[PDB]
From a paper:
CD59 is an abundant immuno-regulatory receptor that protects human cells from damage during complement activation. The membrane attack complex (MAC) is a human immune pore that ruptures lipid bilayers to kill cells. MAC assembles from the stepwise association of five complement proteins: C5b, C6, C7, C8, and C97. Though unable to bind soluble C8 or C9, CD59 directly engages both proteins within the nascent MAC to trap C5b8 and C5b9 assembly intermediates.
To understand how CD59 acts on both MAC assembly intermediates, we next used cryoEM to solve the structure of the membrane-bound C5b9-CD59 complex. Unlike the single stoichiometry observed for the C5b8-inhibited complex, our cryoEM analysis reveals that C5b9-CD59 is a heterogenous assembly that varies in the extent of C9 polymerization. Using 3D classification to separate homogeneous populations of particles, we find that CD59 inhibits C5b9 with either 2, 3 or 4 copies of C9. CryoEM map A and model B of C5b9-CD59 complexes comprised of 2 molecules of C9 (C91 and C92). We find that both TMH1 and TMH2 residues within the first C9 (C91) completely transition from their helical to hairpin states. D For the terminal C9 (C92, yellow), only the first transmembrane β-hairpin has unfurled while TMH2 (red) remains helical. Although transmembrane residues of C91 have unfurled into their β-hairpin conformation, CD59 prevents these residues from reaching the lipid bilayer. A comparison with the MAC conformation of C9 shows that CD59 deflects the extending β-hairpins 60° from their transmembrane trajectory. Residues within two loops of CD59 (residues 55–57 and 32–34) form a series of salt bridges and hydrogen bonds with the extending C91 TMH2 residues. In our structure CD59:E56 forms a salt-bridge with C9:K349, consistent with mutagenesis data showing that a charge reversal at this position (E56R) disrupts CD59 activity.
Author numbering:
A (entry chain D): 194 to 200, 214 to 242
B (entry chain C): 349 to 397
C (entry chain B): 22 to 50
D (entry chain C): 200 to 223, 225 to 248
E (entry chain B): 395 to 408, 411 to 443
């Protein structure tokens, strides 16, 4: 977000930044071997 | 003068993978020398014959 | 077409017990 | 034996743009949107 | 590819008032349907 006013003189500014990041990873491996 | 911005991004990259690999087999033999029985009944995966 | 996308129904029960019946199945078109 | 293989891409990109200005004073508003939906699918079945 | 892009303008004077707007909405889509299916069998019988 950004906001401005400008106009004797007056200047006003507001800024905001937000970031959220998520990484989730899962790996599953299974081996069953039987010989008889 | 006045100005204002609002800006947004949202991204979702889901993914998945799976693999099932199954192998089975049963040679069976009657008759013949026990050495040749064991030597043949052992399953060679590259030549099941 | 990749016809496996329109998977087969399972085989209809064998038309007769003996002397060569037939079993058949449509796709899920 | 049989070897089924399937490879499916769906790509969509959608864009919106709306610029407006009014004067008598001055005012203006710009909006922009970009959307994407993507799916990649691979499926395989091998039987012996 | 599909496009709808439009530009409007207007001035009116009596005092003056004006409006001008531009919109351009667009879509692009692609699909690729690659596939393969190989099958086979072998009987052998010997006597």
């Amino acid at each position: 977000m950004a906001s401005k006013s400008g106009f004797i003189s007056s200047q006003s500014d507001r800024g905001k930044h937000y970031i959220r990041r998520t990484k989730r990873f899962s790996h599953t491996k299974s081996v069953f071997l039987h010989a008889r | 003068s006045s100005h204002g911005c609002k800006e947004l991004e949202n991204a979702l990259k889901a993914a998945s993978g799976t693999q099932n690999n199954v192998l089975r087999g049963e040679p069976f033999i009657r008759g013949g020398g026990a050495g040749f029985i064991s030597g043949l009944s052992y399953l060679e995966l590259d030549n099941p014959a | 077409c990749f016809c496996d996308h329109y998977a087969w129904t399972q085989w209809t029960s064998c038309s007769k017990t003996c002397n060569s019946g037939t079993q058949s199945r449509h796709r899920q078109i | 034996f049989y070897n089924s293989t399937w490879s499916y891409v769906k790509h969509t990109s959608t864009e919106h743009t709306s610029s407006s200005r009014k004067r008598s004073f001055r005012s203006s508003s710009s909006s922009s949107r970009s959307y994407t939906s993507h799916t990649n699918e691979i499926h395989k079945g091998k039987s012996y | 590819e599909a496009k709808h892009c439009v530009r409007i303008e207007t001035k009116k004077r009596v005092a003056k008032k004006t409006k001008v707007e531009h919109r351009c909405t667009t879509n692009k889509l692609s699909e690729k349907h690659e596939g393969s299916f190989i099958q086979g069998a072998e009987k052998s019988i010997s006597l």
